[PDB]
Amino acid sequence: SAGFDRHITIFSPEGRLYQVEYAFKAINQGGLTSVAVRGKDCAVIVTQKKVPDKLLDSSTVTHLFKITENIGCVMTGMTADSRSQVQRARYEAANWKYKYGYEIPVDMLCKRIADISQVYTQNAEMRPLGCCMILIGIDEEQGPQVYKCDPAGYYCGFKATAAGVKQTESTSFLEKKVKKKFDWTFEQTVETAITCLSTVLSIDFKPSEIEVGVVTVENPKFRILTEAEIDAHLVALAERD
Amino acid sequence: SIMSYNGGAVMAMKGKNCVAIAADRRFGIQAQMVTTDFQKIFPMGDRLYIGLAGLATDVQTVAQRLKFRLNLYELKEGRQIKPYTLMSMVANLLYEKRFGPYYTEPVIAGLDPKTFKPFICSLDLIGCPMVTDDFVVSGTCAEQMYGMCESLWEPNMDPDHLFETISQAMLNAVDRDAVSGMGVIVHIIEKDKITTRTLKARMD
Amino acid sequence: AERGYSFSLTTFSPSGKLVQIEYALAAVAGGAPSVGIKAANGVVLATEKKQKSILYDERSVHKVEPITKHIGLVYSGMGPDYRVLVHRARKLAQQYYLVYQEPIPTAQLVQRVASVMQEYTQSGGVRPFGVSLLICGWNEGRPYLFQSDPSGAYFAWKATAMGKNYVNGKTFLEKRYNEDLELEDAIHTAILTLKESFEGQMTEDNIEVGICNEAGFRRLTPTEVKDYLAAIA
Amino acid sequence: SYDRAITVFSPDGHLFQVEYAQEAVKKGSTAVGVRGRDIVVLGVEKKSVAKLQDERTVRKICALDDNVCMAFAGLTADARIVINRARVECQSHRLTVEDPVTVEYITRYIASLKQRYTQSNGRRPFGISALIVGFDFDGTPRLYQTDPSGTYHAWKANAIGRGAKSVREFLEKNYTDEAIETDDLTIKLVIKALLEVVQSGGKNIELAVMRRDQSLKILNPEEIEKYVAEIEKEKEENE
Amino acid sequence: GTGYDLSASTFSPDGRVFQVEYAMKAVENSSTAIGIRCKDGVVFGVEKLVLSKLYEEGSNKRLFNVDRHVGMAVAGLLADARSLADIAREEASNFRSNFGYNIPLKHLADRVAMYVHAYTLYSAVRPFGCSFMLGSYSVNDGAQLYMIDPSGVSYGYWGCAIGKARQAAKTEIEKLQMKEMTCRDIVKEVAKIIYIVHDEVKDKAFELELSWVGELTNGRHEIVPKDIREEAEKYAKESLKEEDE
Amino acid sequence: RYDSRTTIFSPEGRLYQVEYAMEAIGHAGTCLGILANDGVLLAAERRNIHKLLDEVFFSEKIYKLNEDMACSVAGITSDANVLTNELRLIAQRYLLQYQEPIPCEQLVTALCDIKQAYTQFGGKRPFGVSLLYIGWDKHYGFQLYQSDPSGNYGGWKATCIGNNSAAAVSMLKQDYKEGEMTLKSALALAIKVLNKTMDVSKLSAEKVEIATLTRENGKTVIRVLKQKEVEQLIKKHEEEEAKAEREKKEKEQKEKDK
Amino acid sequence: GSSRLEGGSGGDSEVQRTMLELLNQLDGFEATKNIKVIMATNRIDILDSALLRPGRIDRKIEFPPPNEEARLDILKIHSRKMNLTRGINLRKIAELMPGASGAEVKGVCTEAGMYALRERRVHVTQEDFEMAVAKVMQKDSEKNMSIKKLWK
Amino acid sequence: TRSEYDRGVNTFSPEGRLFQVEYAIEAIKLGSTAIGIQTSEGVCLAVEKRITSPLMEPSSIEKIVEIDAHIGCAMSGLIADAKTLIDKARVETQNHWFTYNETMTVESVTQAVSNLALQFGEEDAAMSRPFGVALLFGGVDEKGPQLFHMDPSGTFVQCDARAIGSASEGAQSSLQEVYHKSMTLKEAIKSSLIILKQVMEEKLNATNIELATVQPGQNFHMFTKEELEEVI
Amino acid sequence: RNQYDNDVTVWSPQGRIHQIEYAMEAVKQGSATVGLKSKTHAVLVALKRAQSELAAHQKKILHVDNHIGISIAGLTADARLLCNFMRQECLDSRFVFDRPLPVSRLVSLIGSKTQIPTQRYGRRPYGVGLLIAGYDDMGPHIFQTCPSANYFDCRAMSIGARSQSARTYLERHMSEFMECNLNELVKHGLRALRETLPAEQDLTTKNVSIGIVGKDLEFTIYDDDDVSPFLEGLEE
């Protein structure tokens, strides 16, 4: 059943879209990895950071973007496709604010990108961009919001999500952690995320080779934690554990 | 005036389970009367008629367009259009062309297919739906017809008592209107009957 | 067999069969369990909402959505396709509302969504929408339950089920279904037909049920669905 | 592997799918046509029908103008399309220049339409060969033939269909001034031509004649029966 | 072959686009091009190969001027290079006309990256098979360098090299205190880099292209004046001799 | 292989995909039609009346194209809906332009030109549909045609398309009065052919649909016979056949006596 | 021996040659004297034209699925060696079995017999034959209503 | 080898060949032969007809067609394409006369017909295969009589005497032998007829050949039946 | 190959796009053309082939606006198309600005125009190798462009069938260029064409085509007897 594989619009006899699945395979091909966790009043995203050359600038190399003031995103997948998707999300957020006159809920922004990807999977154009995009934001009524926008058309909302190579182990660890008192504090959520990534990686994190972003019900802005914050959290929290 | 070019007049009222729609018969361009058998009340259903008035070419064209739409709607949605749905359809037809319209004032009169309750409505030349339980007047001599409407109507009205009222009202209104008149056709729609009368008039 | 004539959608087969739409229907059947029952005074739709983890916030993506306050829609198949069809169904309903000032009759909404599917199943670079829709509605006074298939085909149902085990669902409904099944019992029948297809415990949060009666289509809240599940169990 | 594309040459230099449309035309019932001094006639095989199946809806001769007639052979759908476009062209050239449409002109139009469908890659060629027979305004019994390849020619008498080859040979043998000398010998010639391929005679022949400035008329079954009887009498007399 | 590499609109059954990868492979066969970021500018050099002596000094010019103040250095297929240069020129012009101030290099890199991303997405057009670098200096933003490859990634670089010898060029660039050198010395060091990566026995002839953009010229990208080029080449020959020692 | 594209001519001059559609029509339901001096009628075989389905649409295979014409469809359901909508559009376009209900021949020719375009243009598979049109037109009274996927249409006194349509038409040939059949006799013959062609030897209102067009009071009437009339006809025919069987048994008894 | 499809790459050339030799031996130079050849096939459509030629296979008999009262004959033939009660209507069994091949008739008798074997009984009754018909003529039908309604 | 390089006009072969173009050039061969001559006294054209059998009138196998009053055109190849390119030629000649009020030179006319034959599959115009026709335009422009040959690949050139068609390679040699510059139109007619007779199958006899001449004087003259008999 | 050389939209799995190489080959099938320059002139000498001793000889030097000649070696169709585009560009520049278009910019326009049909599946690469002469205000140029859409500013170049002979001759004798004479430069071009010849054959007034541009000399072509002053004076 490998003949139904060379076009995004031809079903397999068992009802599978192989070049939709291969987009997820590309996600895994991204090499990096990402995780996100939402607490009672905070949302925290943690992500790899590979700098395999002294000349690469850490100021530019980053996979935590600011789609708008209140909404932030972590990418997992090919960098070019990721940045195209980021630009699209910025465009759609701006257009929403312009037309309907209020900041786009994370619900809708993830829905909108999911629908763009769906259009591409149905009409045999583009080449479904291979990135997984995880959005964090603050919603006035429900509270914190963490959503994932896979490159096949799901925009699902998550209590704790993982993307990339270590997605399975990350999901297992996050289930284990969530089953115990999901009401987490700001520092406890930052931990849960960083500890999940560290354990699934079998590594201990330097304060630089990890990118962490956070939003809170008191700070509804996409704060990219600096080297100081990363170091402080890692050292102090691992010590006090 | 564009309306005054070809005159005309349409009226409709409702009584007690009976409705009536009355139109003057005339087609004169400017002042040269051309004929006196011009159809202005058209049947769009078993108990639903449209009394398009105003400019002649626009009247005919709206009739053909609306019959096109209604045939499609009935066949595709097998049913007999309810008067409200016909009113909205006519509103869409006229308002599709606000920037240069059909110069006509539709006037719908009929009975609801299911509950057999009466319905009358009017529309302006751009498509503001107009429903009222007493009268609907359109075309030239609008003022005269409104006067007769108001000053010759009583509620809870029966078939013949409504026949006489609608006749008298339109007869007087159209006799007191240049570029209008010379015969009055009156269509009375009932629960099971429809009567098409050609009453007298000051054809002069 | 007819092997060559299965990679395209503008080429018949010696049997006359367009293989690609049948493949799409296979994709549909390979989806979530969903059930529909036409009660004497209502319609009931249900669909397994099971997630792959406790991580997914199981309140963020619903599966029984409205199209008007007299019509609603549930699905089995894929999900992105479903979102597109729901968006277009709402758009068609509103277009009809503007053109004719009357809430869209369920039959016509079904017909137009079917026409959309037909549009998508008739060109060389459009993948047939792989999803089958159950459309519930209340028009005049008679509840309507329709099924729209990727093939552009729309057909009425007294009660049906679709997904991985539609055969079992339909035999169960055949056993348990009688015309004069008032809504309060139709809900139990739908939930039971979901039970006979639903692995694991049918918690109140992993099942979505929507009921369409005169008052208007409404998706039952977690408290109501939990009450019903406890009553049935 | 140099087929299946309407705009692809074979290394020897042929366009094959237009030729295939021609061979599809070869699968139609015989149609013969002759131009006399003042009568141009087209004859055709009805090929009979089941008694339940009406016959007005089975047409092979169509008048495209008062002075131009057309006999089809090939695919029925393509026939209808080409004839419809021919009619609109006729009554459009009438406006373009206030002169009846020359038979040569409508033949050029059909050739142009067929070539327009051939030369592109998303247009199946009109598989129909047509005989156009008419009287130009100046006065001449013209007859042309148009192929699926958009080529037209000026024939004096010819046939297309299942028996085109044999009937063309027969006409070569049995066409002369004496044949085209009257208003009846040409008709007799055309019936004789048909009878070679069509056998049932009574239920397998149809004729339509056009006399100078005279509206085309389709000869009645009785009239064609009388003519075949007359040729049969001549046959037995000379036998 | 593979059966999933034709066209760039098809994911191979691993999550890989063989067309983009072949584009990168074609990139990694052209003459070397180095760029280095200083404290007050960015300097570019290109290992131009005179494929014949008939060609005037001033043949295919792999150092292009995008906007008054951005230099583009290209390695790969130079027709695609010129096309990309025109795209970047037009984008700088559009930015100035639509906003009023000179194009920030980060934005220009982002937009050209999205352009090349468009040409890698589609099945009717091949991805750009030529990599390049964008460098500039402004009193406000400061010296910047960026790389754009066929896949369309705009990672920021302190220094970079593209082409046949990029690993060697890197390895040798790390042997520099780029953070603190100045344009004048980095020009000579670029000359040394080019002459250490160059392979005379393989490329027969050779000529050197150099440029800098920095505060020393007020942000106006300029081909290294003739005298500075000659002095840098002299120092490069001396450094080659010293390495040979 | 000369069947991978609609617009491809075969070396023996056959549009394969067109033949493919024409044979595909066989797998559809079963429609038959009879013309009678008083009226015209169609019969249709409801292949599927699974008891959990519903009967929302009074007609699942016969449609009313306008006041003076009806059409039965057989083939792919999506193409069926598309073609019926285009037919209605053509009819009302003709009404708008000319103000006379379209002659049935003209309506059929229009739709069949649409189908011809499809079978001759670009990347579009031929409509996998065959239609039987009945109607009344002021030019030639009552009329019945059959249109195939290839856009070819034939005017038939009686005809049948679908499953065992060859058998249906053979029996029509056997039992059709070529100029004398009335509407009741037409209904009887239609029931007989349906009984002999439908897979189940037993008929009922749950598997048949009969449509009758007649001119009354100067206006056309297209009536889809209700299940009561359908069952009464099925009965009358079954009991007539049973009486024939009793007569045959009496003949056998006489032969035994001899 | 079946349709002679092209060879060289993916054609059953060897079985095709077997068929060709059979062709020549049935009819060919120095033909046969008194050797008769009977052939059987469940579907002839693909059988090759040279064989089905009326020179090698002269006559082509068909075996239509036993019609009415032919099914009765088969029921009698395969129920003679049995234990039937007074009140078994093999005719009624025939009508209840429409369009059933002779294999089906044998299976129906056999399954009625096995049902009799079940209940320590040496008698087969009408209802037992009915259950046998039901168990033998199992007409599996696709339940995918969509695939079934594809065609109007 | 030529299984993926000669199935499209826009896919170069490893050699650098447009195999659809050579195939059109081959399709030129199939046609009936034509021979055009240009001498100091005008231009002559003699062509062979291939009448299959009578009842096919002379005025349907158009090998010679008149291009303006000062050119004649001999065709070799597919008739539909020949009609299209002759129509292009006529409309161009008349448009040039209309805009500039002068007689289009034969160089200009064959240049423009070639310019039409160029646009095989360019996405700015609409054909998809080369016009499979090779044409001879023999006319009288201000440079005295001239004769310009066009091949299906849009290449046109002057030719003091050129033969085209099925009898191409078998008549170029004869033209090479016989032609000389100081030739009169009578010699041209006789020589062209002799070469045609040499390379035809049926016996040249005034109803299997067409002849025309465009002179610095009387316009394009299509030889009539009596003239054919005289020359023959 | 065999599955990566069917269009210009597919890279091969080794970094080379095959259709462009095929077009590069196509350029070699023309005729020898040797173009060259001095401090004030630019001369293009091309070998006009003969299709028969009756048919005239193919032209190979076309005349773009008065400060551009062009020698074409490749597909005649593409040569004509790019000639028309160059003429259009020259005239458009003359219309907007009143200055003859620099021949280092016309070439850029041609390069863009020829790259565009090497990155989309809607056309084929062009098939003419072009030698653009001309004397802008700076100095005479000889630009070369090949279907690959790369343009070279050549001290003196050649292209076509048997173009190496010319290129090697240029290697050898280009040291004299930039100081020669109005006619000596043409003589050097003629010698280049001589070396491109297949021997036996020579430079005859017919098969030799010469085009000249430079200061105080707009573009000119010497054919038929206009070339005799060159061949007659040419060293045996």
Author numbering:
A (entry chain G): 6 to 246
B (entry chain P): 2 to 205
C (entry chain H): 2 to 234
D (entry chain J): 2 to 240
E (entry chain M): 5 to 249
F (entry chain I): 4 to 261
G (entry chain C): 255 to 406
H (entry chain K): 4 to 128, 132 to 238
The authors write:
Proteasomes are the primary protein degradation machinery in eukaryotes and comprise a 20S core particle harboring proteases capped by one or two 19S regulatory particles (RPs). Successful proteasomal degradation also involves PSMD14 (Rpn11), an essential zinc metalloprotease on the 19S RP that deubiquitylates substrates to promote their efficient translocation.
We determined the structure of the TXNL1-bound proteasome to an overall resolution of 3.0–3.3 Å from cryo-EM datasets of affinity-purified midnolin–proteasome complexes. Electrostatic interactions facilitate TXNL1 binding to PSMD1 and PSMD4. The C-terminal unstructured tail of TXNL1 engages a hydrophobic groove on PSMD14 and extends into the PSMD14 active site, where H289, the C-terminal residue of TXNL1, coordinates zinc along with H113 and H115 of PSMD14. The conformation of the AAA-ATPase is most similar to the human ED2 (root mean square (r.m.s.) deviation = 3.0 Å) or yeast 4D (r.m.s. deviation = 2.0 Å) proteasomal states, with PSMC3 (Rpt5) at the top of the spiral AAA-ATPase configuration and PSMC6 (Rpt4) fully disengaged from the substrate. Wild-type (WT) TXNL1 associated with proteasomes, but the interaction was severely impaired by mutations to disrupt the interface with PSMD1 (R234D; lane 10), PSMD4 (E136R and D162R; lanes 3–6) or PSMD14 (lanes 11–14). We observed similar results using auranofin, a gold-containing oxidizing agent, in place of arsenite.
